[PDB]
Amino acid sequence: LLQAEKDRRVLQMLRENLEEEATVMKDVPGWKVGESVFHTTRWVTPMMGELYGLRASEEVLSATYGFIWYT
């Protein structure tokens, strides 16, 4: 149960970090919408920079460093 809550939280999280990306600019020397940095195709757990963008304010700081240095 606990996990079936998370997997939905990231797929929700990518879409907003994509659908709210592809509507930033569509540039002629830009990128295709949601390409792959790899050749291979399957689901590979994303890097922190994927979920949180350059947003980089606080709730990030409480995510990556959240567990370490304290309750």
Residue numbers at the binding site for another protein (CB under 8 A): 1, 3-8, 11-12, 14-16, 18-21, 23-25, 27, 30-31, 34-49, 52-54, 56, 60-61, 63-65, 68-70
Of the candidates 64, 43, 44, 56, the one whose C-alpha atom is nearest the C-alpha of residue 17 is: 56
Of the candidates 5, 4, 1, 36, the one whose C-alpha atom is nearest the C-alpha of residue 18 is: 36
Q: Report, in Å, the least distance between residue 15 CB and another protein.
A: 5
Q: Report, in Å, the least distance between residue 51 CB and another protein.
A: 9
Q: Report, in Å, the least distance between residue 1 CB and another protein.
A: 6
Torsion of CA 49, 52, 58, 61, to 10 degrees: -40
